[PDB]
Amino acid sequence: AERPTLPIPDLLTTDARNRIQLTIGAGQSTFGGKTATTWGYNGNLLGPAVKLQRGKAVTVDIYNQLTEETTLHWHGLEVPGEVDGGPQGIIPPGGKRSVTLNVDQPAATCWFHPHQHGKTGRQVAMGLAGLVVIEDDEILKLMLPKQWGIDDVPVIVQDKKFSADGQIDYQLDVMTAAVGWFGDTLLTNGAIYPQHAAPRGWLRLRLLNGCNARSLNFATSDNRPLYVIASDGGLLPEPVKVSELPVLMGERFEVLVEVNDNKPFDLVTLPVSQMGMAIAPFDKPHPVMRIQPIAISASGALPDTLSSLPALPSLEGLTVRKLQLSMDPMLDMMGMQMLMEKYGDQAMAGMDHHMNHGGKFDFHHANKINGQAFDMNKPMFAAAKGQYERWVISGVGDMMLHPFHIHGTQFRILSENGKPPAAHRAGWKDTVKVEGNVSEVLVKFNHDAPKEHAYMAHSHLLEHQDTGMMLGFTVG
Ligand SMILES: [Cu+2]
Ligand SMILES: [Cu+2]
Ligand SMILES: [Cu+2]
Ligand SMILES: [O]
Ligand SMILES: [O]
């Protein structure tokens, strides 16, 4: 059979009442010919791309048609805590919540997803994620590829695993609380190995790692380069040519890739050095999508200069906040041993060379920051508003991957896990790698967040977030 075409999320803008309507609900999808219950925004799976303009406000009406509580967070969008949609932003089953978003940041590809307390991994795994396309006046002058679904395409890459009856097989248990939820099936905008027909010239891909726990590393099957033009929080100062592009959970990058007649190629993901993630079929490069060239000229440009990136300021005198991540040694060892028992040595490929004892030992609060599993009732600190701060995040103490995300900001990385950031990671970021080492980021919060609607800071390995590796903080 030929490959299915890449599904393209609809690009949604406001009505005359300046509203966007999002409905959260359950439906059915098909994977490898078997039906599965899935959840989506304005559909059965995944979601639309909400288009936003800097300096314009929009109202979003969010209808929860699930039978359980959910929340909706705009990952990457800088908004007051009251509309950030962290775990306090509950939408009752059958209810509606409206938010007004006053967009105040540069053009970027952001995304949106649930943030239900303790259940974010399940609700993402069941299907909920959408996109946000922010535009501003500056980016349009660059004349980048801009025809949505033709030469400007979102690429949301996610793994799932399924039970024998075809349903999504999600469990938050000791093993996945330890290593994360991951699967053997790769989806690209919800489809298994689709093709995308692209005009000759430049193709812009807006890449999102939407996996719960799997890191990815994009490349092309014939080693043509990718030109990175943007990171989580928007354009880089100039394109950065790469041969491969590691993407942590929740991160976005936009790249341009050349499309030439008569020479289809795949976007692939290369095996990563992360526990559990190189089990077959991920022990080898894995196709993500086939790019099928069309002999029609694409009009987009790859300009020499994209944007202005301001200098890092002086660090002297800035508040230094320490965030020590930790896992429970016993439960980390127990989850890792279950992984090894299940899959054997392959569960550590590529890595560097039973009774109830009560609630004190409950894996649901095994992961922590500064000695505390997430307490929704107690923000850990009150950050300054409009002031740069230096946040120091340590994963010393274990070797698991902690992509650390801070709500309410786009920051600058000073140190990523003990090294200065790569050039394509040196611009605006909302995620920083922490793994066995220490990262430091320069953050500023432009909006208030009160105790009742606090900003989150957490690992975006969802099973770790849900089992305590998150803190709340206020601003203002
Ligand atoms: Cu976020
Ligand atoms: Cu997020
Ligand atoms: Cu978050
Ligand atoms: O997030
Ligand atoms: O998140």
UniProtKB/Swiss-Prot annotation:
Disruption phenotype: Disruption mutant is slightly more copper sensitive on complex medium than wild-type strain under aerobic conditions. Deletion of the gene does not affect copper sensitivity under anaerobic growth conditions. Deletion of the gene leads to elevated biosynthesis of enterobactin under conditions of iron scarcity when copper is present. It is found in: Periplasm. Keywords: Copper, Metal-binding, Oxidoreductase, Periplasm, Repeat, Signal. Exported by the Tat system. The position of the signal peptide cleavage has been experimentally proven. Cu cation 1 binds at residues 73, 405. Cu cation 4 binds at residues 402, 459, 464. PROSITE patterns: MULTICOPPER_OXIDASE2, TAT. It catalyses: 4 Cu(+) + O2 + 4 H(+) = 4 Cu(2+) + 2 H2O. Cu cation 2 binds at residues 75, 113, 460. The keyword Zinc does not apply. Residues 327-359 are annotated as: Methionine-rich region. GO terms for cellular component: outer membrane-bounded periplasmic space; periplasmic space. Contains a methionine-rich region, which includes a helix that covers the entrance to the type 1 (T1) copper site and blocks access to the T1 site in the absence of excess copper. This methionine-rich insert is involved in the binding and oxidation of Cu(+). It also binds additional copper ions, which are important for the copper-associated regulation of activity. The methionine-rich region provides at least three additional Cu(+) binding sites: Cu5 (sCu), Cu6 and Cu7, which play related but distinct roles in CueO oxidase activities. Belongs to the multicopper oxidase family. Multicopper oxidase involved in copper homeostasis and copper tolerance under aerobic conditions. Is responsible for the oxidation of Cu(+) to the less harmful Cu(2+) in the periplasm, thereby preventing Cu(+) from entering the cytoplasm. Probably primarily functions as a cuprous oxidase in vivo. Monomer. This is Multicopper oxidase CueO. It comes from Escherichia coli (strain K12).
